[PDB]
Curated annotation (Swiss-Prot), chain A:
Changing residue 4 to T: Reduced host ACE2-binding affinity in vitro. The chain holds residues 498 to 547 of 1273 of the full protein. Changing residue 4 to Y: Increased binding affinity to human ACE2. Binds to host ACE2. RBD also interacts with the N-linked glycan on 'Asn-90' of ACE2. Cleavage of S generates a polybasic C-terminal sequence on S1 that binds to host Neuropilin-1 (NRP1) and Neuropilin-2 (NRP2) receptors. Interacts with host integrin alpha-5/beta-1 (ITGA5:ITGB1) and with ACE2 in complex with integrin alpha-5/beta-1 (ITGA5:ITGB1). May interact via cytoplasmic c-terminus with M protein. May interact (via N-terminus) with host bilirubin and biliverdin, thereby preventing antibody binding to the SARS-CoV-2 spike NTD via an allosteric mechanism. It comes from Severe acute respiratory syndrome coronavirus 2 (2019-nCoV). Attaches the virion to the cell membrane by interacting with host receptor, initiating the infection. The major receptor is host ACE2. When S2/S2' has been cleaved, binding to the receptor triggers direct fusion at the cell membrane. When S2/S2' has not been cleaved, binding to the receptor results in internalization of the virus by endocytosis using host TFRC and GRM2 and leading to fusion of the virion membrane with the host endosomal membrane. Alternatively, may use NRP1/NRP2 and integrin as entry receptors. Changing residue 4 to Y: In strain: Alpha/B.1.1.7, Beta/B.1.351, Gamma/P.1, Theta/P.3, Mu/B.1.621, 19B/501Y, Omicron/BA.1, Omicron/BA.2, Omicron/BA.2.12.1, Omicron/BA.2.75, Omicron/BA.4, Omicron/BA.5, Omicron/BQ.1.1, Omicron/XBB.1.5, Omicron/EG.5.1; May enhance affinity to human ACE2 receptor. Residues 22-44 are annotated as: Disordered. This is Spike protein S1. Changing residue 4 to T: In strain: 19B/501T.
UniProtKB/Swiss-Prot annotation, chain B:
Binds to host ACE2. RBD also interacts with the N-linked glycan on 'Asn-90' of ACE2. Cleavage of S generates a polybasic C-terminal sequence on S1 that binds to host Neuropilin-1 (NRP1) and Neuropilin-2 (NRP2) receptors. Interacts with host integrin alpha-5/beta-1 (ITGA5:ITGB1) and with ACE2 in complex with integrin alpha-5/beta-1 (ITGA5:ITGB1). May interact via cytoplasmic c-terminus with M protein. May interact (via N-terminus) with host bilirubin and biliverdin, thereby preventing antibody binding to the SARS-CoV-2 spike NTD via an allosteric mechanism. This is Spike protein S1. It comes from Severe acute respiratory syndrome coronavirus 2 (2019-nCoV). Attaches the virion to the cell membrane by interacting with host receptor, initiating the infection. The major receptor is host ACE2. When S2/S2' has been cleaved, binding to the receptor triggers direct fusion at the cell membrane. When S2/S2' has not been cleaved, binding to the receptor results in internalization of the virus by endocytosis using host TFRC and GRM2 and leading to fusion of the virion membrane with the host endosomal membrane. Alternatively, may use NRP1/NRP2 and integrin as entry receptors.
Amino acid sequence: QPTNGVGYQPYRVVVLSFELLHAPATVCGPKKSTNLVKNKCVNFNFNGLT
Amino acid sequence: AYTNSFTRGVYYPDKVFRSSVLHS
Ligand SMILES: *[C@@H]1O[C@H](CO)[C@@H](O)[C@H](O)[C@H]1NC(C)=O
């Protein structure tokens, strides 16, 4: 009821569970790819594997 | 009715490539 005390009011819940695996990513964060480089010493990031 | 399974029923335990190695 709209008059309820704070503990007895309704609350919405969302739980976000992450399928974090060494497998093909399909949800990814806002990020831009570079071109690929080979046969040279580079810093790198593949899907979050820095 | 019955049969012996011998060495059936093993599977790839995780999605990681490994080679020339013994793993537990
Ligand atoms: C499997 O179990 C049965 C009794 O449940 C037994 O008679 C049989 O010998 C066993 N299977 C094999 C392949 O020996």
